[PDB]
Structure formats: C-alpha cells, structure tokens
C-alpha cells in the first residue's frame, strides 16, 4: 500500500471534496455517506482512491469476492446453456425448436443449475466433458 | 385461449422479455441499496 | 382466432420449411413486404397497400395524441403562456433515480425536465390554447380515431374488400382529392382561424386574462363581441347576398409583411390566402372527365403533342402509369422530396407562426430536419424509377416515344454530362485551392474577394433589386414587400433580429457553383445507373439477370459493383456531401450576418461578426473559423445541472470507424475465422446446430453504409444542437 | 487464353456446357461412370473469366476448374473497340 | 455397413471427411463410386448426398 | 476513394469516353500509342494502401516537430 | 438480304470491328414480331431471311440462345466470324442445334483424367515453364 | 493508473497484429473452404462468388489488414 | 525536438520492418518448402496444432479488448 499514497481518512483534499460532495440521488446524505464509506481505502495527491490487489487483507475482499461472484454466475449460465443444447438434440426436431424455445422444458434446466461447479468436477474426473481428437470429425486443413 | 403463448413464444419477444426482467432486476438492487461499497 | 401467427414464412414457399443456417433469419426481414414477388395478381396487392396505409395513419394519430398528452401534464405551457420570452418551453420531466437526477432542465418557475426544441407551443400560441383538459380530450379523439380507422382497415380487408376496376379512375381520384380534400379542409381551417385564432390573438396583445377570455361557444351565436370589432362583422352584414365585398375590409385584408407585435406575419393575410387557394384549386380540380359525359379524354391530350423533333410525342404512357406501381411511387417521391426541400428553403424568410424569427432555436432544427428528409427520399424516388426500369417496361408499346428516344442516344448525353461535371468541378475547386496557395504564399493580391481580383454575381443582385420596389406598380393593392431579405427595412423586435436584407458579395459565387457541381455529379451517377440498367456495352444480360446482384465474376478484369443500387450507394454518399455543406453554409451565414443582438439604435451586433468576407475563401480558414466556434463549448458543455447531457458526439465517432471497417474488408477471412471458432466449440461439445455463416457482401456493404450515415448525421446534429443551446 | 482444368467427378448432367456462353466445352466419349461422355475444353482461346460454368456444376467439389492465366489479349479481354 | 448404417468417410478432399452419414442406397455396379451416402450438414448448396467407393468408408458401431 | 469504389464502374464510362475521340473532328488526327483500359484490382488495392500510408505519415510528423519546437 | 426495321442508334460498329473482325447472324423467321437487341432497341423482324451485323461474340450468342430457340423456337441460324480481309469463319452451329452433348464418336486432342490430391509442386517442378498437368 | 491502461492497450495491439499475420502465414498453403490456393500462388486469387463471395483470400489480403493494425498501434 | 523526431522516426522504421519479416515468412511457406524432407520434425508438429494457437490468441485478444473498453466506458 506504498507508492506514496495517503490514507483516504486523513487526506485533506479528500474531505475538502467531501464537504460540498454533490449528493447524487434523492437523499441528502447520499454524497457524504459515500465519502464516509471511502475512509477504508488510501487516497493520493489526486484525492481519489487507488485499489490494491494482492490478497493482502488491507484490500483483499475489495476485489476477491466480486471475482468469485462473477465466476459463480458465469459458470451457471454457461452450464445451463450447454445442458439445454445437449438436451435439445434428443428430440429429432432440432432446428425447428432452435428458434422456438420449449418453455416447459427450458425452465427446469435453468432452475437446476444449483450445483454446477462440483458436478462439473465430476464430469471432469469421469471425463464427460471432452470428445476425442479424432472422434470429433471437424476436418482442419 | 391459452394458445397465445404458443404464438407469443418466438424467441425475439422472449429475448426482450428476459432482458428487461434482468434489467429491472439490476435496477432494484441499485434502487434499494446503492450505498454499499 | 389466434392459431396463425407463429407459422413463419407464411408468405414465401422457400423459407417456410426451416432454418438450415443463419441465412434463413436474414431473408426473413428482407422479403416481408415486396408482395409483387409473391404472385401475379393485383387486387391482393392493392388491398395490402390500403391496409398498410391505414396502419401508418394509425401510428401517426397515436404518436401525435401521445405527444399532446405529454404536452398537457408534463410541459410548462400554461406558465409559458403569459410569457413566451422569459420562459423556455420544455417537456419530458426527468425520472429521479441514479443517473438521471442532475438533468433537471429548469426553465423558470421551478419547472424542471427537458428543454425541448420543436416549437409545438408556437402552434399552441396560434391555436389559442388555454387549459390542458381540452388538450386531453384532443389526444383521446386522436387515439380513438386511430383505433377506428385501424378497425376499418381490418374490415375492408377481411370482410368487404374493394374490387379491381375500383383502382384506375385517376380522373375521379384527382377531382375528389384536389377539390374535396384540399379545398374543403383548407376553407374549414380558415373558418376556424377567423372565428377563434385572430380574436384570441387580439386578446394576446396586453395580458387580457387568457382563461377569462370566453370560449368559442360564447361566439357561436353571440355576435355582440363579434360586433365589437369589425363593424361589418355584425352578423356579416351578409353583403355577399348583394355581391358587395367592400364592407369586409376589416379582417379579410392584404398586408404582406412582418407584424412586430406577433413575432410572425399578419395572420389576416394567411386567412385570405387560404380562402383564395381553396376556391382556386376547387375550380381547378373540377376539370377532368367523369360519369356525366363531359371532360378531357386525357389519354388523347398526350397523343396530340408531337412534331419534327418529338418523333411521335407522348404516345402510350398510361399503361406505365396505371399497370405498374413503382413508376408512380418514384415520380411522387421525387416531387415530394423537391417540394420538401423548397419548404425548408422557404420558411426562414416568411415565418408563418407567432414567435418564430424571435425564437432562434426551433428555426434551423426544423429547417435541417426537413432538408435532410427531402434528399434522403428523392434518392429513393430515383431508385424506384430504376426498379421500374428493371421490373416494368415493354418493347411493343414503346416505339419511338419520347421515352425510347433517349435510350437510343444515351452515350452522347452522358458523355457531355461527364464533360460538364469535370469542367465545373475543377473550375471551382482548383480555383479555390489556387487562392489557398496564394494566401499561403505571401501573394495576397492574387486573392479573389472584393479586396482583390474581382467577380460579382450581378444577376442575383439585379433580380433582388427588381424585387425590392415591387409594390405600388406590380403590387398596387399591396403594402410591404413580400420579404425583407431582398429589400425594405430591417424588421426586428427587442434586442433581437427578425429579418434584415442579405448581402451577396464574392464568396457566394464559388459556393453556389460547387452546389451546382455536386448536384451535377449526383445526377450523373443516378442517371447513369438509370440508362445503363438493362444493357451495358459489355453486360447484355443485366435486366436478364436482375438489379440486386454483386458481380459477374472476374471477367474482363473486374466487374464487381455493376448493379444499379450500388450506383445509388455512391449517389447517396454524394448527396450526403451536398446537403452537409449546404447546411454548413446556411447556418454560418444566418449566424454571421443575419442573427445576433440589437441596440436601441437598431444596431445589429451579429453573433460572429461577418466572417465570410474574412475567411470563407481558403480551406484552412474554413476549419478554423467554423468548428472552433462549433465545438469550443461541447468539450466543457457538461458538468452541472442544466448541462449534464454528455452528448454522444464523443460516441458517434466510434460507430463511424466501426462502419468503415465493414467497407474495406472482404468476407472469406471472416468465414475462415468463423470455421476456427466452430472447431473449438465442437471440441467442447457446444456446437450450435444452426451453422453460422458470414454475411453476404451486399449485406455487409449495406450495414457499412448504414452505420456510416448514422454516425455522421448523429455527429452533426449534436454539433449544432449544442451550438444553439450556447446562444438560445 | 486462360487455362481450363478437368477432373473425374463429372457426373454428366451437362449444366456447364449449357451455361458457358463462350463455346469452350464439349462432352468427349468416356467409359468410367454412367456418363459415357465427359466434359472438356477444346477451345480455350475464347475463355472469358466469367466462370459461370462451375456454378452450374452440381458435383461435390465441382468437377471443372479454371486456372486464370496471365496471357490476355483483345479476345480474352473482350472489347468491342 | 449396409443400407441404413452410419459410416465415416476416408476420401481426403471430402467436405465431410471423417464425418458420419447413412448409406441410403447400396449400389455395387461397375462404377468406381458405388456407395450412395446421405448427410445433413451442408457444404456448397447442400450436397449432403454423395457417392464414394466403399473402399473409402468405415463404420462406427 | 481508391479503396471503396471498385473496378466494375470505372470501365463503363471509359467506353463512352473512347467513343468521343473517334467522332469529333479536328482532333481525330492523333491515335493511341496503346489502347487504354481501367486499372487492375490488385494494383487498385496497392495504390489505395500507398495513398493511405503516405497520408498518415506526413501529418503526424509535421504535428510532432512543430509542437516540440513551438512549446519547448 | 433482309435486315429488321430500326431507327438507328449510337452503339454499333467501331474502329476495330472493320479493322480486325466482323460478326454476322441469320436465320429463317416465317413471322414478324417485336424483339430486343443487346445494344438496345425494340424492333420487328420479317418473313424468312433475317440478316444482322454485329461486333461482339456475346450479343449474337445471347440472341441465339435466349431469343430464338427459347422464345421463337427458330433454330436455323448461322453465326459467322469475319476476318479483316473479308473472309469468314464457320465456328458454329457445329452440332445442328448446339445440343453440346450428342455425337457418334468425338474429337480427341489433349486429356487429363486425374484427381487433385496429388498436385504439382513448386520445389519439385522447377527450372522450366510447364504447367499443372504434366506429371 | 494510466500507464496500466495504455500498456494493456499495447498488449492488445500487438496481439491482434500477430494474430492476423500468423493467420495469413498459416493460410499461405490453403484453407478449409479453399485448400487449393497453394498452387494458385502468392497472387490474386479471388474465387468468384461461390458462397456469398470469397474476395480477399489471397494470402496478403492479411498484409493490408496487418499494416492498418500496425499503424494504429505505433 | 531532435531526439523526439529521432525516436519516432526509428520506431516507425521499425514497425513495418517486422511486417516485412512476417510477409517473407509467408511467401517462404509457398515457394520454399518440401514435405517429405521434414516429415515428422518440429515444423510439422507445429502445423499439427496451429488450431489451438490461433483460437487461444483470438481468445486473449477478445478478452483484453472487451475489458479495457469496459473499464474505459465505466
Ligand atoms: C452455452 C453456450 C455457450 C458456450 C458454452 C460457449 C463457449 C465458448 N465460446 Mg461461445 N457463443 C455462444 C454460446 C456459447 N459459447 C453464442 C450464443 C454466441 C453467439 C453470440 C457465441 C459466440 C462466440 C464467439 C464469437 C467466441 C466464442 C468463444 C467461446 C469459447 C471461449 C469462452 C467463452 O464462453 O467465450 C464466449 C464469448 C462470447 C459469448 C462473446 C468457449 C468455448 C470464443 C473462442 O475463442 O472460442 C474458442 C469466441 O471467439 N463464442
Ligand atoms: C444504464 C442505466 C439506465 C437506466 C436503467 C435508465 C432508466 C431510465 N432513464 Mg436514463 N440515462 C442513463 C442511464 C440509465 N437510465 C444515462 C447514463 C443517461 C445519460 C446521463 C440517461 C439519461 C436519461 C434521460 C435524459 C432520460 C432518461 C429517462 C429514463 C427513464 C425512461 C427511459 C428508459 O428506461 O427506457 C425507455 C423505457 C420506457 C419508455 C418505458 C428510465 C427510468 C427519461 C426519463 O427520466 O423520463 C422518462 C429521460 O428523459 N435517461
Ligand atoms: C431516454 C431517451 C429519450 C427519449 C425516449 C426521448 C423522447 C422524446 N424526446 Mg428527447 N432527448 C433525449 C432523450 C430522449 N428523448 C436527450 C438525451 C436529449 C438531449 C438533451 C433530448 C432532447 C430533446 C429535444 C430537444 C426534444 C426532444 C423531444 C422528444 C419527444 C419527441 C418524440 C420523438 O423523438 O420520437 C422519436 C423517438 C425517439 C427519437 C426515441 C419524445 C417524447 C422533442 C419534443 O418534446 O417535442 C415536443 C424535442 O423538441 N428531446
Ligand atoms: C373528396 C373525396 C375523397 C377524399 C377526401 C379522399 C381522401 C383520401 N384518399 Mg381517396 N378516393 C376517393 C375520394 C376521396 N379520397 C375516391 C372517389 C376514390 C376512388 C377512385 C379514392 C381512392 C383512393 C385510393 C385508392 C387511395 C385513397 C387514399 C386517400 C388518402 C390519401 C392520404 C392522405 O390524404 O393523407 C392524409 C393524411 C393525414 C390527414 C394525416 C386520403 C385520406 C389512399 C389511402 O389509402 O389513404 C391513406 C389510397 O391509396 N383514395
Ligand atoms: C413510402 C416509401 C417507400 C416504400 C413504400 C418503399 C417500399 C419498398 N422498398 Mg424502398 N426506399 C425508399 C422508400 C420506400 N420504399 C427510400 C426513401 C429509399 C432510399 C433510402 C429506398 C430504398 C430502397 C432500396 C435500396 C430497396 C428498396 C426496396 C423496397 C421494397 C422492399 C422493401 C421491404 O420489404 O423491406 C424489407 C427490408 C427491410 C425492412 C430492411 C418495397 C416495395 C427493395 C427492393 O427493391 O425490393 C423490391 C430494395 O432493394 N427500397
Ligand atoms: C410576371 C410579372 C408579374 C407578376 C407576377 C405580377 C403579379 C401581380 N400583379 Mg402585376 N403587373 C405586371 C407584372 C406582374 N404582376 C406588369 C408588367 C404590369 C404593368 C401592366 C402590372 C400591373 C399590375 C396592376 C395594375 C395590378 C397588378 C396586380 C398584381 C397582383 C394581382 C393579384 C394576384 O395575386 O395576382 C399580383 C401580385 C394588382 C394588385 O392589386 O396587386 C396587388 C393590380 O392592381 N399588376
Ligand atoms: C491509364 C492511364 C494512361 C496512361 C499511362 C496513358 C499513356 C499514354 N497515352 Mg493515353 N489515354 C488514356 C489513359 C492513359 N494513357 C485514356 C483513358 C484515354 C482516353 C481518352 C487515352 C487517350 C490517349 C490518346 C488519344 C493519346 C494517348 C497517348 C498516350 C501516350 C503519350 C501521352 C501521355 O503519356 O500523356 C500525355 C498527357 C498529357 C500531357 C496531358 C502514353 C503512352 C498518345 C499516344 O498515342 O502516344 C503519343 C495519344 O495521342 N492517350
Ligand atoms: C531489404 C529488404 C527487402 C528485400 C530485399 C525485399 C525484396 C523483395 N520483396 Mg519485399 N518487403 C520488405 C523488404 C524487402 N523486400 C518489407 C519491409 C516489406 C513490408 C512492407 C515487404 C513486403 C513485400 C511484399 C508484400 C511483397 C514483397 C516482394 C518482394 C520481391 C519482389 C520485389 C518487388 O519489388 O516486388 C514487389 C511487388 C509488389 C509490391 C506487388 C523481392 C524479392 C513481392 C514478392 O515476393 O513477389 C511476389 C511481394 O509480393 N515484399
Ligand atoms: C473502431 C474501429 C474498430 C473496432 C472497434 C474493431 C473491433 C474489432 N475488430 Mg476490427 N477492423 C477495423 C476497425 C475496427 N475493428 C478496420 C477499419 C479494419 C480494417 C478493414 C478491421 C479489421 C479487422 C480484422 C481483420 C479483424 C478485426 C478484429 C476485430 C475484433 C477484435 C477483438 C476485440 O476484442 O475487439 C473489441 C471488440 C469489440 C469492441 C466488440 C473486434 C470485433 C479481429 C477479430 O477479432 O476477428 C474475429 C480480426 O480478425 N478487425
Ligand atoms: C479512380 C479509379 C480507377 C481509374 C484510374 C485510372 C484510370 C488511372 C488514372 C489515370 C492516370 C493515373 C492519371 C495520371 C495522368 C498524369 C497527369 C500524366 C502524367 C504525366 C506527367 C508526369 C507530366 C480504376 O481503374 C479503379 C480500379 C479498381 C478500383 C478502384 C479504381 C478507382 O478508384
Ligand atoms: S462438370 Fe458439371 S455440368 Fe459438366 S458434365 Fe460434369 S456434372 Fe455435368
Ligand atoms: S469463364 Fe467459365 S464459362 Fe466462361 S469461357 Fe471460361 S470456363 Fe467457360
């Protein structure tokens, strides 16, 4: 947290901005409150805070858990999409329904993405995620 | 009848539906507690 | 009865089966309306056209009534009523959430929102609108009429549809429309004007308690107040029974000029105008032959006009004008476009509404809007002319006619045309850059303005002059000149100019000449595609093959871009240039020597200071002395309450470059990249069944030109919108 | 002019010979498949480069190809002047 | 590998190389390319049907 | 200009423009060293790219040296 | 000697088409009807002989293919190339109605019946100027 | 922070530049939908509109694109 | 001014100097190359897996572009 960066608590220009900090929304405490919420980080001569990313508990949670949340949701959406696609093909109405979504079937697949990570891990160990270099017949060259 | 969904489920109309749902979703959390950082 | 929509491809037999690849999607949005490509029958076509017209009218009514309703409940009209100067109209109040809270356009009286510029209140300063409830009823009427005529379309298509001979009575068409539609509507509106408009206008001179001013019911049968003013307007004295009209000199007069108490002209002139037009084209529209065995046999008139150079004249033209549709479409589009642009070129010297020249924001917005639409659709008129040429013609009914006589000697025409274009082009632009070099070369005596080598457009000056002293002799029963840009006195109000005479010096010359230049080349491209549509000196199968196709292989070298709509592509690029520099010229002059402020001496202190006589002669000056002013605030025009609208000018450049990306590149490259991504997806068992395929080259060209135009026009409207906000 | 290239996949539908407007093809007697007469180019000198022919070839990996040469002339360039 | 069996392709230049199609009609005549196979994946204009020499085909199952 | 427009349009008008010399008098004396035709495709691409690159080079150099010698 | 009824145009014969080559076409049309010419024009033919002069090997074949046999069914038209000296060539018709596939034995000059999988190579075929065929 | 930003921009720039270049290089022999080009040469080949068109496939079409992508980077 | 002009001068010289290298690599791939003489050596093992290379390269380009532009517009 070095590099010549003053704490946002005691950076004079920080509170200087905080004084007439333009309260954005329809509540008078909007601006001031957020500046109060910006005492944990450490400002600089620009008067605005920089973010440190190291796992260092000074700013660890301020970047780690959002990353993990994104991984959660991206895994969910990718998993349910792939599962839906795999399911459609066992109907022999393939491209008919490619544009007409079968809602009574599209729902439970979406609702059943609860345990995507570890299940995916299983498909990794079972090897249920990849087809074989030559079995996949998509010809290169 | 209820056959309307048979003719409302097209994808495109469903696209905008889902997207607007997710949009107001994102709004309410940004509308109820946009004060957590 | 809902079992029918979700059966796509209902109109085409080919794409009805199934979506093999993504291509099936694209054509779905491409052939949904050209039902001439569905059968050979015509009654069905006509019925579809009727229903579509009804639907368009319905959306018209809907949007106008909704805009009213916004004007009633969320617009500071009735507060801006008492003061149209110290208040700037607005609407569309901002919703108080994160992101749009600082954008409260406060225009006095605490009314926040969005400071609009469309001048509907100006109509609402002439219609005499007091309370918003009547306006509420107006919106209700508009929307119910919309729904009504939509239901009418449904009925006239599904239950009782018209027959086929109901089409081609152009005679009764012209008669009914010309007379009944135009004359009756115009005379009805004039009657509304005289009864209500000018009365409340009178009553808007000194603060005469607007809502307290009576309602029309207090004047339907109450002639007392109607007898207050206009003594002849007791009842009317009804001297029309006695054929005497001298009594009516009260309201039905002829002034012809600016009324410095209304911000516009004298409304009585407009009323008598509308009267005269009404009866004039009523007796006009009573011309052609119909069901009483009396009238012109119009298909014989065109038979008569022939002669030595004519060949055989205008023989055989009605099969074209009624059997085919695209013909009519194209011609009417061209005419409407021209008409619209003259309208634009018209209503900045004769403001027909109250508070127009005094309101320096709505003027150029309306002007540029209409001007853009004009060209933007006349090119489409020409395109439909070409599509007629490829779709509809006849070798039999077109022997030696004035039509065929050009398609036989096209080469001379177009060669001389190219000649003219080259001549004008460099004769103007190279002259310009010559003067540019001279100024950059310390040889200023070789410049071309008044202070240097001379040239003066005497013709415009003399025509304006002979227009200056018109009344008295040419116009005895007329009081003031038609406008004040030709001649007369500098008419104004407050410290704010309304109209002054316009000066034409040296810089006018090359500007008008390059206008003509670009128009010439535009005609060149379009007419070239027109004539060389069916047969070229190398491609004798064009009409035998179509008019929307990319190329004909690398024969004869290259042949790509040999259809016609690519001709209109190039043409629309060029007309973009034309109209862009046209609006540049108009805005700069009417902000340089027409508009500004005024002192008690009538001293017009213009905005810029007459910059054409100083810099509008060399290129480097044209960028300096125009866009320095046109942007020096947009950089900082954001950052407060009534500034926060960070405009998407910063944003439009991106779409412009993204546009030009599509133009310069082929498609096989994208196809191969697609195939590689497909390989990867197939390796991870996520291969989309519907196999993606890259765009077709014509599709890519279309999206490229679309994005190009969009970015450019967005950029420019952002420019002058913010520029007017800096002064209005 | 340019060079023409023939293969074995000629099924013999003969849509190319009816497509080339330049008289550079003929079905010479063959034996292999049911065709018995396979297309070939006897009169290359009038080749044009339109290559409307293989667009008329339905065979998978269309049986005819044209190697677009470099020895062009007034005939191969096709000028009326 | 009979009429109605799924087999992959040995012809190299083939657009559906290694791809599986169904033997629609087993011809066995004097032509060098007896076997008629049908696919559904589209090359140029959908030539999902083609012929080969069955010395260029291998089954899967 | 060189990049966008392609060689399927710049040949039709060369035809009619050849048509001129053949039929005007007092100038039909002279004839052709060699029969002129439109450009080639690859050459068109090349010249367009060359124009683009030369346009890009000059302005930036002028800007940088002028700025450095005018601001210090 | 029969030529159709036309009023003159501006895209006919040029300085090459009488210093290098001439093209002519003629058939037998027992009727008279309106037709279109590729240089532009809608005119009428005459009974029997129908002689026409032109400069390109495309207008003629376009007339012969699409107009005569596909619309008017006429199939007895000669198409003749002409040298500068005034002498003529008879390329086609060479098979009667240009069917382009029927004969009892045909010409034989040049053959290449080979697939593409084994193609000519740069580094193997070198120091000479032969093409993609000789293996 | 700015240096962080622009340096990642440089990374991107060279990444796409080498992308298009190696694509053209490894297609100097042939593509999946046009494998023959090895014999057509480092030359014009256009292969007229077989499927929507095949313009700009000629093994240094990539060179133009790469030149643009290098100019903006520098 | 002197050192500045020299710096941009030399870097500009440098940029498409490399493009020359890549272009001549491409043209080498068509003219100067024999198959059997290099059967199974390292070059062929590169060609056998070019696919994953170009795919991951496209991947990193897309990633960096998306995210840098997103942060900018943020
Ligand atoms: C459940 C559906 C699904 C799944 C699992 C994937 C999975 C994948 N896609 Mg993908 N894609 C999908 C739907 C899906 N896609 C759809 C609907 C589209 C159309 C918009 C695309 C368009 C697309 C492109 C254009 C690219 C990928 C790429 C990729 C790969 C990189 C990781 C990623 O997700 O980037 C997805 C990226 C975006 C959605 C953007 C990965 C194999 C990238 C790659 O490198 O493939 C190996 C790549 O370049 N995809
Ligand atoms: C990206 C997030 C976001 C969201 C969800 C909204 C949501 C909204 N904006 Mg908005 N706005 C945003 C960002 C956003 N804004 C930004 C970044 C700007 C520029 C600073 C604006 C500038 C802006 C203006 C100027 C206006 C809105 C308006 C609106 C409202 C109607 C428009 C609408 O939702 O679509 C349309 C939906 C329906 C018509 C239903 C709505 C509450 C309008 C408003 O408040 O009145 C309606 C309005 O006039 N916005
Ligand atoms: C959320 C975006 C949004 C929406 C929905 C509207 C909607 C509207 N604006 Mg608006 N406007 C916006 C953003 C928006 N604006 C922004 C960002 C600015 C710049 C600050 C303006 C500046 C502006 C002016 C100056 C005017 C309007 C007007 C209008 C009305 C005319 C209808 C119309 O254009 O139909 C087409 C629909 C669209 C273009 C969408 C309509 C209610 C006009 C009006 O009120 O007329 C009475 C008018 O004069 N607007
Ligand atoms: C005096 C009688 C009269 C009047 C007033 C009209 C009025 C009209 N006719 Mg019409 N018509 C008439 C007699 C009349 N017709 C007769 C006798 C015939 C039989 C030959 C027709 C046959 C006819 C056809 C075939 C069509 C019209 C259409 C129209 C509309 C043109 C669009 C317009 O004006 O925008 C007004 C816009 C606003 C008010 C906003 C307009 C409402 C067109 C249509 O469908 O309407 C849209 C159309 O296609 N007319
Ligand atoms: C009232 C005006 C009007 C009307 C009724 C039409 C109607 C039509 N136009 Mg059109 N057009 C117009 C104005 C109009 N145009 C203008 C102003 C321009 C110039 C900008 C064009 C430029 C234009 C082109 C370039 C083309 C058409 C085409 C068409 C036809 C197919 C349209 C379609 O189904 O879109 C489906 C596609 C989308 C909605 C996208 C259809 C008959 C197309 C045609 O020839 O079809 C016969 C075509 O290629 N138009
Ligand atoms: C093309 C030239 C031209 C034009 C457009 C006009 C136009 C007009 N003249 Mg006019 N006039 C002209 C030449 C012209 N004059 C000449 C050369 C003479 C000399 C004989 C006159 C003598 C003349 C007289 C004596 C009167 C008009 C009047 C009028 C007006 C008639 C009312 C109307 O709407 O029409 C109209 C403005 C009348 C009027 O009341 O003007 C307002 C009128 O009394 N003019
Ligand atoms: C594609 C570009 C191009 C090029 C490089 C040339 C090159 C040439 N032309 Mg030429 N020409 C061209 C296009 C071109 N032509 C076109 C499009 C036309 C049609 C109008 C002509 C019509 C033409 C005529 C009529 C003559 C030439 C002549 C010549 C030769 C000497 C004149 C000269 O160089 O220009 C000098 C030009 C100026 C000084 C201006 C020279 C080999 C002359 C010739 O035959 O050789 C002496 C000659 O008499 N040209
Ligand atoms: C000292 C360095 C050097 C040397 C000796 C060469 C030498 C050569 N280059 Mg080359 N080149 C260089 C740098 C160099 N280049 C650089 C820096 C670039 C990138 C801007 C290129 C881009 C380049 C291309 C794109 C092509 C050549 C070609 C050629 C060959 C033909 C020469 C010619 O004028 O055709 C130039 C021909 C055209 C521009 C067309 C020749 C062997 C050409 C070739 O191999 O022949 C087909 C070729 O196509 N070079
Ligand atoms: C503002 C201009 C602009 C922008 C935003 C893009 C954006 C893009 N181009 Mg692109 N391009 C442009 C101009 C532009 N181009 C021009 C003028 C040319 C020359 C004609 C090209 C030539 C070109 C090629 C040859 C390739 C790209 C590729 C790409 C993608 C890079 C991946 C990425 O994350 O980018 C950011 C993505 C978004 C902003 C969305 C992306 C879609 C490459 C790609 O990814 O293809 C798969 C690629 O192969 N473009
Ligand atoms: C303009 C243009 C042409 C036409 C260009 C031509 C005909 C060449 C221009 C003629 C010469 C180069 C003009 C220069 C003549 C000089 C004035 C003579 C030189 C003599 C001096 C040195 C004294 C194409 O052929 C073309 C082809 C493919 C894509 C785009 C285009 C394209 O954009
Ligand atoms: S190349 Fe095509 S048209 Fe010619 S014989 Fe073979 S299959 Fe028939
Ligand atoms: S371009 Fe094609 S159709 Fe024309 S002559 Fe050559 S091979 Fe025959």
Numbering used by the authors:
A (entry chain O): 24 to 164
B (entry chain Q): 8 to 44
C (entry chain E): 25 to 752
D (entry chain H): 1 to 81
E (entry chain W): 2 to 62
F (entry chain G): 665 to 736
G (entry chain N): 7 to 141
H (entry chain G): 517 to 590
Q: What does the publication say?
A:
Photosystem I (PSI) is one of two photosystems involved in oxygenic photosynthesis. PSI of cyanobacteria exists in monomeric, trimeric, and tetrameric forms, in contrast to the strictly monomeric form of PSI in plants and algae. PSI includes the pair of associated chlorophylls that excite electron leaves, known as the special pair, P700, and between 96 and 112 antenna chlorophyll a (Chl a) molecules (Jordan et al., 2001; El-Mohsnawy et al., 2010) that function to increase the optical cross-section for excitation with a subsequent high-efficiency energy transfer to the special pair. Upon photoexcitation, photo-oxidized PSI transfers an electron from primary electron donor P700+ (a special pair of Chl a/a′ molecules) via its internal electron acceptors (A0, A1, FX, FA, and FB) to the terminal primarily ferredoxin (but also flavodoxin) under iron-deprived conditions.
In this study, the structure of tetrameric PSI from TS-821, a thermophilic non-heterocyst-forming cyanobacterium, was solved by cryo-EM with a resolution of 3.72 Å and has an organization of a dimer-of-dimers. The tetramer exhibits two types of interfaces: A–B (between monomer A and B) and B–A′ (between monomer B and A′). Therefore, the structure is pseudotetrameric and has C2 and not C4 symmetry. The obtained cryo-EM structure of the tetrameric PSI of TS-821 resolves 44 subunits: four each of PsaA, PsaB, PsaC, PsaD, PsaE, PsaF, PsaI, PsaJ, PsaK, PsaL, and PsaM. The inner cavity is surrounded by four PsaL, two PsaM, and two PsaI subunits. There are a total of 358 Chl a molecules in the tetramer, 91 in monomer A, 89 in monomer B, 90 in monomer A′, and 88 in monomer B′. Interestingly, only the A–B and A′–B′ interfaces are conserved in contacts and packing to the three identical interfaces found in the trimeric PSI. For interface A–B, the contribution from Coulombic and van der Waals interactions is 0.1 kcal/mol and −16 kcal/mol, respectively. These results indicate that the structure of the dimer-of-dimers is mainly stabilized by the dispersion interactions (London forces). In the tetramer, only the lumenal face of PsaL at the A–B interface has multiple bulky (mostly non-polar and aromatic) residues, while the stromal face has polar residues.
